[PDB]
């Protein structure tokens, strides 16, 4: 179906402990495929998925160069942000950046993304038009003005419509056995007595990929949204994800509860019961 590529950068200042650390990671959908860490003994863009390993030395050296340059830019941006927010050089701060393109099944750009945060708060974002900006605050408006003046959006649009989509298409092909394979959840319901008149029904989804999944409990065919404990989808470490949804049910009423599982790897949503 649809796919995405994302790059995420985190630049973390640490006054008195050297230059800000810069860590970048790249994802296709929910699969990390590259990393860079400026604190590594020998910093390089490094593969983190098998299907990227085939990329040649020009790719790796180019990515490494780009990451080192990006680290420098974001170290500068950290210094700039201090100014824009009237902040001390003594504090630790963080810039995060996301870039992304989403494509449809035919590989055509659905939309592009480029967003920035400072200390975990939205700073500036490229709008969906890939032409204009939304600045979160008056500091970011300074950046906006600079980026409007320099027609930065055009360069970003060029990347997002062009290389991002093209390289995503390539990765999708090279990694098709995994990137284009949904692993449906392995589902089951467990029962955990809490007391003589209540038990937890926990609906498990395991081993699924991609991460997007909907687990819902119904009681008498009514969604138990407010009464469901839903843990964050979590990585198993083998590429797949896990999630559970639990409801506390009256003893003997277990059959009034149905767990509903929606996942792209399922031809139809599953209904489960204890």
């Amino acid at each position: 179906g649809s796919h995405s590529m994302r790059y995420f950068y985190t630049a973390m200042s640490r006054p008195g402990r050297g230059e800000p650390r810069f860590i970048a990671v790249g994802y296709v959908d929910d699969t990390q495929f590259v990393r860079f860490d400026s604190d590594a003994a020998s910093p390089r863009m490094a593969p983190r998925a098998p299907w990227i390993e085939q990329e040649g030395p020009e790719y790796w050296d180019g990515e490494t160069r780009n990451m080192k340059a990006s680290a420098q830019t974001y170290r500068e941006n950290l210094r700039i942000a201090l100014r824009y927010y009237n902040q001390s050089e003594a504090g630790s701060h963080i810039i995060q950046v996301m870039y992304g393109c989403d494509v449809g099944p035919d590989g055509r750009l659905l939309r592009g993304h480029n967003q920035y945060a400072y200390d975990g708060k939205d700073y500036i974002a490229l709008n969906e038009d890939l032409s204009s900006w939304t600045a979160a605050d008056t500091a970011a408006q300074i950046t906006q003005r600079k980026w409007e003046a320099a027609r930065v959006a055009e360069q970003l649009r060029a990347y997002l419509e062009g290389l991002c989509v093209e390289w995503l298409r390539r990765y999708l092909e090279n990694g098709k056995e995994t990137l284009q394979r949904a692993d449906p959840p392995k589902t089951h319901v467990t029962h955990h007595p809490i007391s003589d008149h209540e038990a937890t029904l926990r609906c498990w989804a395991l081993g699924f990929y991609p991460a997007e999944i909907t687990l819902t409990w119904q009681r008498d065919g009514e969604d138990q949204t407010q009464d469901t404990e839903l843990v964050e989808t979590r990585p198993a470490g083998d590429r797949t994800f896990q999630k559970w949804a639990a409801v506390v049910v009256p003893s003997g009423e277990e059959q009034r509860y149905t767990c509903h599982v929606q996942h792209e790897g399922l031809p139809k949503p599953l209904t489960l019961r204890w």
Binding site: Y7, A24, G26, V34, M45, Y59, G62, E63, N66, M67, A69, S70, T73, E76, N77, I80, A81, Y84, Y99, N114, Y116, I142, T143, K146, W147, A150, V152, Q155, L156, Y159, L163, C164, W167
Partner: peptide, 9 residues
């Protein structure tokens, strides 16, 4: 591939 769009804030 990572973007080369390096813009100072």
């Amino acid at each position: 591939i990572s973007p080369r769009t390096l813009d100072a804030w």
